[PDB]
């Protein structure tokens, strides 16, 4: 169950598809406040085509359900992402996840 | 359980690699059970810098304030570049009070910078959703976007319902501040982190209201006070740009709300003596026509035909042309000038004998009159001027009746106004009389000036018979501590005043006062006396832009100070201060600001802006003070923000002592004054809190030998604290505290706590949330307590305990078995501290007892996740009593962020810009919710001991190509935090 | 405290009476002197002319009509007739009072501005 | 895990750079409080990085240039040899030259 929040509009005009790259600059975030991944200040524009299931299943249907260059929150669940322990060390158990996910560019 | 300690990091990096051999499933354990938690391991990300910028537009409610109830004010956005640095930019626009905000570069609490929005004194609005107490709390809007370029962001404030509303664009934001507490004048403040540049629309002259305000709302500047020009400027600053280099700035004083009340001395209380005709028809027949005296001839000559109606406004009439009964309304005017006086304490003087003896009735032959002839009417009575004393007297004449006037009129209604409107009720001049303008007191005060010259001429020559942030203590490093040579550091005095100014050693206590005990040896240059342990007359006191030159030298065991290149000699006669001074651990640069005081602390950098060290140093063998450091000295000021730390074992009063293993008395940590009934007894009102807190639950769900099952499915907690006999239960107040809670008050009870009801908007208007937070959730135990037990002799010993449950975030209070009507409701992922604010009265104080009661499980399974279902109580070494110390040591940021503040236009307004973005790394200690400086710890080796070896455990435990664990490292550290941590040099 | 009730403000055409009360309640003390400002509507606040304690008819710049202007000593109530009704004469008539005499003013600013200025009624007048 | 390695490479030899020419004006202040804490890690992550291969032939004259100016050119000096450095400065230096 994720969870759109709109931090800040953008296009709302042009949406992925399933089979289209998507490079998010992302910052990943607990639920008590703890990031777990900056890959902002990773300096990585990550890049993942949707509908391939290479990603947490919330946060891409939350990245494909957002538009290019709309700053949202995605607010995914302990089911849909992570639910026991994924990446052990980074994430708690049955914890919900924040994603902070704007698409710089939708190719 | 036992607390931060470097022995069990180094028993879990022995568990994982054994001769070069690494074992993986040690390896994972450690991982999965340690890393995920991160409530044990103090944590390091990388944040931004918040400078905040107000436009020192304090208003405020008080009971008879001159200031006006209601304010509205605009900032709008002209850029924003987001994201700058891989963070969000901190953009907050709101109030906030004078007295509590102190938004402090670096440091803070939470996991960042704080800005308006980040406490509860401060209430700000991202454009999403609002900020107080460092929470966000999302709010309706139709943009629904943070402050974005072109965006204006209008904020009005009503004290008289107190409710602060924001409006986007002219879409009012559905929710509003309320209830929240007025002590203090509110000011309009921004953050703007970096990379971004807004303007301040405050109406009027000062910008444009691009929206219209609210009926009732009067523009904000409309408030700037009558002696001061409106500008810019930081909240409080520790450091200040000058020309000859960084200016150290002392706390400021800000005006309270008391000072716009004008109660003034009352004069008609006091009858007057038998001789009240006698001096008041003398002083009433002079002041009858000094107007005369200097409007006849000069303004518009008097016609008789008429009565000052019709461009007559001087009249030379001796006989009182005009009524008899409004004419003796002036001698019970000049009797009540001698009530005044009586009320000041003016007696009847006849020094000098009468005046008319001397009289010289000018009467100039360009000044004459028609009616009654032409005569000088006033008594000019020769000359006589105006005693010291009496130019005191006369300014405190004026001072009573301009009060008197001005609380009538704010009985009338009327408000203060930059510009005035007498429709309104709203004038430029009922302010309070210090709050006046000088050309303002002046025309008030000169014919009392006069009136009381003529009274000296009579012969009536009658005369009229600590908070620990008013001094800012800047010291070194205690890494640059000397112990051998001769140093020499100049200490520029900028503003004249109580800047005392020496060397240091490294165990300098925080609020004690600089000098005042011996581990300093200053020089006070206000008073000009040397200070070590006690005060002594010494050198001479300074002036503007004078250097005093500090030098130390080690070999001879002396100090010495000079000043503008020439040395200061004691009253003795001798060249140097202090004499036969052991080295001991070491000397460093310090100097204590007082209020409202500037000094540029010139260390010897570089001798060309060591001005006078040719003349007094470089010849004598004194080396500069870090001569060759190539980078700038770091330094460390007095916080004066009151931070709750550990009770020190050699605490001279206050004792904290165990006792657990009692069949019936529960584990518990009781307080004593040590030295109670003695001649150094503190009556203190001491704030005691456990180091460990109860954190709520992540999600409020619905949810004799005790019960098991019950005791299982427990999620309520009991704690109990027992005053002692003797202890009055009115200086008591039992329950819990946030972790942002700084408050020092020596006179706090229940109504000086904290709190603000965030009260949600909908588009009809309803309410929706209307959530209450509150900054310390407690009860008082006079409430529990009956009303007339006087002595506590009776041994009653009551217990308060606190039942809080986690499951629905509520907490009640009970007293002996009787429960209480207060009850709390507090929102999830809170952390609550057991806390006791206890004014002392006996020996025996108060003692928490740590127990638990009926199906009700104890703290420690509530604090302590290894103890999660353990019901027996229990207290191991790191829970343990902690006293709100008021000041502790701060260091200074090697950089701040330098903000350009001016005026755009005329119509544009002021405006705020910063463009370059300043990263610093932060120490969060998770338990406690408060983020330090990375380099902060190069002074407390017990954070760093254990902080390096957290990192020799990471490097241990995704050693020998352990993949798996350092992909799950790189999330605790991150790439960014790496690369700044190797270029960081500091 | 010394509130002023002024009291009236009936439409009445140019040439109708108009006789006004306005009830001076409060203290004895800044009573003297005091006068109708009519604040005429947008357009600041002419003065009647200034009775003083005693009935001391002092003319003002607003005394273009009839202006019977006489205070009660006892009842404390100015009456004001306005029999003689103009375009000129329309405006909220606020009377204040004040303790300062007329033209005549020892003091300075603080007791020059120390009146009790109560609110007026809004006399529309044609 | 992945971390920029070219940017690592400049960032190694800036470091090193501005660390030989502080070394050089000898400071009261060196980086870390002392010149060990100064050198050993910046010389330990260069000796990985080179016995990794990242650097490039550049960059390896940059480093051959630094350790000795005048044995190592290509045509003040502040030969990192030439210095005097703590016995552990010593073993990391005697690292890159094995």
Redesign the interface.
């Known amino acids: 169950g994720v969870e759109i929040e709109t931090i800040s509009p953008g296009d709302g005009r042009t949406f992925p598809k399933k089979g289209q790259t998507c490079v998010v600059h992302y910052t990943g975030m607990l639920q008590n406040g703890k990031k777990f991944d900056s890959s902002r200040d990773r300096?990585k524009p990550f890049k993942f085509r949707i509908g391939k299931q290479e990603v947490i299943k919330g946060f891409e249907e939350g990245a494909a359900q957002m538009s290019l260059g709309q700053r949202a929150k995605l607010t995914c669940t302990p089911d849909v992402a992570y639910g026991a322990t994924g990446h052990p060390g980074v994430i708690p158990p049955n914890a919900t996840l924040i994603f902070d996910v704007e698409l710089l560019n939708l190719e | 359980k036992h607390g931060r300690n470097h022995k069990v990091l180094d028993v879990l990096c022995s568990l994982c690699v054994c001769n070069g051999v690494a074992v993986r499933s040690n390896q994972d354990l450690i991982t999965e059970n340690l890393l995920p938690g991160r409530e044990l391991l103090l944590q390091t990300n990388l944040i931004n810098y918040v400078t905040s910028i107000r436009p020192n537009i304090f208003v405020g409610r008080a009971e008879g304030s001159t200031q006006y109830g209601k304010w509205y004010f605009e900032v709008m956005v002209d850029e924003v570049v987001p994201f700058l640095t891989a963070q969000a930019t901190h953009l907050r626009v709101g109030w906030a009070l004078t007295e509590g905000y102190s938004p402090y570069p670096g440091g803070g609490e939470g996991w960042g910078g704080n800005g308006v929005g980040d406490d509860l004194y401060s209430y700000g609005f991202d454009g999403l959703h609002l900020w107080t107490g460092h929470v966000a709390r999302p709010v309706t809007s139709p943009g629904q976007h943070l402050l974005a370029p072109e965006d204006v962001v209008s904020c009005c404030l009503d004290l008289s319902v107190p409710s602060i509303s924001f409006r986007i664009n002219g879409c009012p934001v559905q929710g509003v501040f309320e209830a929240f507490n007025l002590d203090g004048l509110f000011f309009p403040v921004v953050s703007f982190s970096a990379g971004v540049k807004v303007r301040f629309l405050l109406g009027g002259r000062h910008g444009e209201f691009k929206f219209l305000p609210p009926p009732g709302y009067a523009p904000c500047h409309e408030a700037v006070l009558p002696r001061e020009r409106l500008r810019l400027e930081p909240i409080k600053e520790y450091r200040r740009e000058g020309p000859r280099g960084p200016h150290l700035v002392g706390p400021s004083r800000c005006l309270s709300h008391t000072d716009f009340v004008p109660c003034p001395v009352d004069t008609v209380q006091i009858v007057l003596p038998p001789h009240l005709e006698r001096i008041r028809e003398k002083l009433a027949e002079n002041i009858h026509e000094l107007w005369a005296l200097t409007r006849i001839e000069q303004g518009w000559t008097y016609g008789p035909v008429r009565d000052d109606n019709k461009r007559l406004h001087p009249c030379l009439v001796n006989f009182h042309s005009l009524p008899e009964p409004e004419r003796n309304y002036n001698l019970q005017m000049s009797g009540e000038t001698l009530k005044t006086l009586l009320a000041l304490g003016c007696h009847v003087g006849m020094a000098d004998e009468k005046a008319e003896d001397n009289l010289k009735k000018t009467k100039l032959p360009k000044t004459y009159m028609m009616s009654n002839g032409y005569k000088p009417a006033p008594l000019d009575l020769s000359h006589v001027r105006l005693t010291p004393a009496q130019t005191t007297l006369v300014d405190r004449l004026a001072e009573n009746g301009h009060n008197v006037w001005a609380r009538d009129r704010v009985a009338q209604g009327w408000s203060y106004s930059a510009v005035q409107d007498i429709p309104a009720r709203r004038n430029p001049r009922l302010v309070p009389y210090r709050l006046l303008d000088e050309a303002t007191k002046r025309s008030n005060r000169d014919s009392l000036c006069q009136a009381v010259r003529t009274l000296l001429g009579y012969g009536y020559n009658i005369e009229p018979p600590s908070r620990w942030d008013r001094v800012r203590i800047f010291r070194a490093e205690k890494?640059?501590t000397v112990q051998s040579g001769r140093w020499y550091f100049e200490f520029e005095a900028v503003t004249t005043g109580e800047m005392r100014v020496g060397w240091a050693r490294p165990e300098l206590r925080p609020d004690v006062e600089l000098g005042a005990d011996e581990l300093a040896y200053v020089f006070n240059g206000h008073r000009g006396q040397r200070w070590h342990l006690g005060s002594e007359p010494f050198g001479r006191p300074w002036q503007s832009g004078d250097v005093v030159g500090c030098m130390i030298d080690l070999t001879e065991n002396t100090i010495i100070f000079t000043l503008n290149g020439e040395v200061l000699m004691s009253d003795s006669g001798s060249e140097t201060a202090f004499r036969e001074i052991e080295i001991g651990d070491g000397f460093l640069p310090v100097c204590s600001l007082g209020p409202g005081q500037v000094g540029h602390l010139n260390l010897g950098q570089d001798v060309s802006s060591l001005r006078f060290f040719a003349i007094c140093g470089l010849q004598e063998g004194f080396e500069p003070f870090?001569?060759?450091?190539?980078?700038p000295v770091t330094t460390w000021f007095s916080k004066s923000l009151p931070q709750f730390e550990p009770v020190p074992p050699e605490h001279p009063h206050y004792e904290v002592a165990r006792m657990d293993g009692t069949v019936d008395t529960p584990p518990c940590l009781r307080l004593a004054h040590r030295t109670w009934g003695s001649q150094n007894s503190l009556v203190e009102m001491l704030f005691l809190r456990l180091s460990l807190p109860v954190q709520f639950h992540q999600h409020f769900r619905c949810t004799n030998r005790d019960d098991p099952e019950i005791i299982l499915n427990t999620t309520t907690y009991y704690y109990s604290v027992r005053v002692f006999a003797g202890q009055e239960p009115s200086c008591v107040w039992v329950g819990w505290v946030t972790p942002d809670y700084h408050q020092h008050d020596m006179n706090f009870d229940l109504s000086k706590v904290r709190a603000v009801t965030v009260t949600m908007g909908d588009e009809q208007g309803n309410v929706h949330s209307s959530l209450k937070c509150s900054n310390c959730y407690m009860v008082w135990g006079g409430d529990f307590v009956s009303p007339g037990q006087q002595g506590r002799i009776s041994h009653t010993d009551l217990v308060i305990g606190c039942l809080v449950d986690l499951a629905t975030g509520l907490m009640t209070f009970t007293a002996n078995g009787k429960e209480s009507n207060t009850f709390f409701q507090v929102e999830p992922n809170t952390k609550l501290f057991p806390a006791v604010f206890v004014l002392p009265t006996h020996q025996n104080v108060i003692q928490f007892e740590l127990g638990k009661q009926k199906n009700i499980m104890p703290l420690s399974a509530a604090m302590f996740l290894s103890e999660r279902k353990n019901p027996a109580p229990q207290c191991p070494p790191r829970l343990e009593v902690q006293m709100l110390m008021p000041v502790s040591w701060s260091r200074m940021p090697n950089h701040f962020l330098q903000v350009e503040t001016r005026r755009a236009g005329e119509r544009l307004g002021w405006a705020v810009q910063c463009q370059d973005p300043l990263t610093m790394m932060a120490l969060h200690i998770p338990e406690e919710n408060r983020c330090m400086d990375i380099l902060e710890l190069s002074e407390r080796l017990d954070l760093q001991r254990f902080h390096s070896h957290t990192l020799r455990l990471y490097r241990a435990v995704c050693a020998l190509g352990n993949?798996r664990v350092?992909?799950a490292l790189?999330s605790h550290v991150d790439?960014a935090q790496?690369?700044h941590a190797?270029?960081d040099?500091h | 405290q010394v509130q002023l009730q002024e009291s009236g403000g009936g439409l009445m055409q140019a040439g109708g009476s108009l006789r006004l009360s306005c009830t001076a309640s409060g203290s004895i003390f800044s009573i003297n002197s005091m006068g109708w400002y009519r604040q005429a509507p947008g357009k600041q606040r002419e003065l009647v002319a200034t009775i003083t304690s005693g009935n001391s008819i002092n003319y003002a710049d607003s005394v273009k009509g009839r202006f019977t202007i006489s205070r009660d000593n006892a009842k404390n109530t100015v009456y004001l007739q306005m029999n003689s009704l103009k375009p000129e004469d329309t405006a909220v008539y606020y009377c204040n009072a004040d303790r300062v005499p007329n033209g005549y003013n020892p003091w300075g600013t603080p007791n020059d501005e120390y009146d009790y200025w109560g609110q007026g009624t809004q006399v529309t007048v044609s | 895990?992945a971390?920029?390695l070219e940017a690592?490479r400049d960032?190694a030899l800036r470091?090193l750079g501005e660390a030989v020419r502080?070394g050089g004006?000898?400071?009261?202040?060196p980086?870390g409080?002392s010149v060990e804490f100064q050198f050993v890690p910046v010389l330990k992550?260069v000796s990985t990085l080179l016995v990794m291969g990242i650097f490039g032939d550049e960059d390896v004259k940059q480093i051959l240039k630094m350790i000795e100016p005048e044995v190592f050119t290509e045509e003040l000096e502040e030969g990192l040899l030439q210095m005097k450095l703590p016995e552990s400065v010593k073993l990391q230096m005697c690292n890159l030259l094995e």
């Open positions: 300096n | 890494s640059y870090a001569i060759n450091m190539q980078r993949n350092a992909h790189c790439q790496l690369l190797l270029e040099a | 895990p971390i920029p690592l960032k470091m502080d004006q000898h400071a009261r202040d980086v409080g992550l």
